[PDB]
Design a protein around this ligand. Structure first.
Ligand SMILES: Cc1c(CC(CO)CO)n(C)c(=O)[nH]c1=O
Ligand SMILES: Cc1c(CC(CO)CO)n(C)c(=O)[nH]c1=O
Lengths: 313, 309
């Protein structure tokens, strides 16, 4: 059976993910590598109208006190459902084609973001910004689809100053430095969480250490430097100080989903061609998988091209 | 070989039963070979958010009165459904790893108050029919329906509409408002769901029959697929956008492997309880994945009941 290499480029927006991905894709033949782009058309028109603008405007109004936290939360929750829909459906239809982890792959699929971006990372950042409740975040977490074998996720590293500059120049988006800090923090925590879990970390065991980044490498992070630290919110705690079991189970799910992922860190603090080559080098250590059928490869290509054509900018 | 497990999801339109019928189910779970996972009302009223049900019905009411727009309503309904389904989704996520392949007497029987599709498909679809939810949101929820594991036995209630109104009227939940339009919508959705499973099990291909919605198994017009001929999901030329077609492919995948059983609620609580037991003979059992799965599932089920009532 031919092999497949799936690579999800994720991390805070504004670092150069899209450019780097396009450049990498431009290196290979036409049908040896395919790009599943940002589904902007879905967010702007198909799933809803100007979702990105609606999100930034809602956050803005909240920060201005023009709307309540509850009003912002319902809007953000609904908006994130729209945001993640394309990722979710793609994963659901791709799942049957993915076999065990496996040598040139017959096909490389590069994704612009993974489902956890819309089901975990941004919701978590909105939570830190006061525009989403922690319960809604955990509901999203409980909905994260089972992690498929060979889930290679590439996160990005970039100095905040450089990130801010790059963002202060380059939809309906607004320049929110607080959101940038929050999303940068969430993705940093995410990387540590994966490393924490792969180093044998048990959140239930270390929860008490919770009172007052890189993966595939380094020592085991302290739980306080992982995503688990975000869910110590009073809303999730029972009178006795412990997490309600329903939320604790959502954390068990978070652990299960993240522990099997293969996370890599890409340094975006360089030229476009530089990032491309760095990413190319990174793919050398990524995990490939066998496909379930002989026709899976062509089917996957069609799926990717169909997705790109319909929801890509 | 690992012990066997029998999972039963009691679903269908709410308000068909009686308090005594439920207590019998609680009684059923008294023995350690059977556990009854009740509705997570505490999660809906307090843990996940404040009075979620009240919020849902007030929102629809305000939409009907024209106090709010369809858009405002949809945002509220979508957010509320995420809260409503969270207990089911988290339960499925943690239980899933314990379910093995299809398989005497089950070592354990888990009777759940509802399946995740109730909150991820059925109520959302009903609200769509009530004009309070976009069809894109419904398909987004559908895209998140957990994979259907072996032994997914879902019991759907059957009851004449007038009798259903009678029972619903006498057992309204906190914040609920007696809405006959919503009753009709949810009853239709579940009727369509039952037909859909049969349509799929008999080899129906929604893509092949799609053209019939605009032109032995149920007619596609009598399945959930007819609800997605919604204009918002179609391109200028009338074709369904691929992203939504894929969501329908997911729906077909999830529903085909479900084992539906119809429970007639038009009888006494003892009758309904007996009818349920009668239905178990044809239900599919599965093996668990580990020797410790049974005890774990039991703890999970009991903890859920105790914490979320
Ligand atoms: C992915 C995502 C984003 C980021 C956006 C690019 O800046 C789309 O990639 N945002 C802002 C959100 O608010 N929610 C989201 O889910
Ligand atoms: C599961 C569910 C329900 C029904 C609930 C009773 O109100 C269980 O019997 N409802 C009403 C909703 O409005 N949304 C839902 O998701």
């Amino acid at each position: 059976m031919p092999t497949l290499l799936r690579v999800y480029i994720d991390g805070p927006h504004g670092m150069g993910k899209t450019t780097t991905t396009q450049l990498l894709v431009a290196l290979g033949s036409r049908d040896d590598i395919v790009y599943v782009p940002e589904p902007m058309t879905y967010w702007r028109v198909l799933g809803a109208s100007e979702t990105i603008a609606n999100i930034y405007t809602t956050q803005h109004r909240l920060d201005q006190g023009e709307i309540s936290a509850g009003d912002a939360a319902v809007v953000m929750t609904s908006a994130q459902i729209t945001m993640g829909m394309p990722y979710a459906v793609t994963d659901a239809v791709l799942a049957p084609h993915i076999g065990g982890e496996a040598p040139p792959p017959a096909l490389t699929l590069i994704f612009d973001r993974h489902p956890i971006a819309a089901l975990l990372c941004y919701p978590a950042a909105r939570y830190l910004m006061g525009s989403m409740t922690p319960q809604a975040v955990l509901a999203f977490v409980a909905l994260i689809p089972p992690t498929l074998p060979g889930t290679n996720i590439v996160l990005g590293a970039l100095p905040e100053d450089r990130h801010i500059d790059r963002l202060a120049k380059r939809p309906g988006e607004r320049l929110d430095l607080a959101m940038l800090a929050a999303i940068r923090r969430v993705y940093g925590l995410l990387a540590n969480t994966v490393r924490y879990l792969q180093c044998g970390g048990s959140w239930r065991e270390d929860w008490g250490q919770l009172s007052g980044p890189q993966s595939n490498a380094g020592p085991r992070p302290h739980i306080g430097d992982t995503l688990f630290t975000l869910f110590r919110a009073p809303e999730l705690l029972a009178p006795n100080g412990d997490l309600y079991n329903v939320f604790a189970w959502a954390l068990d799910v978070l652990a299960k989903r993240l522990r099997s992922m293969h996370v890599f860190i890409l340094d975006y603090d360089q030229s476009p061609a530089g990032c491309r080559d760095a990413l190319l080098q990174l793919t050398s250590g990524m995990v490939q998988t066998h496909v379930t059928t002989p026709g899976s490869i062509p089917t996957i290509c069609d799926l990717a091209r169909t997705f790109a054509r319909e929801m890509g900018e």
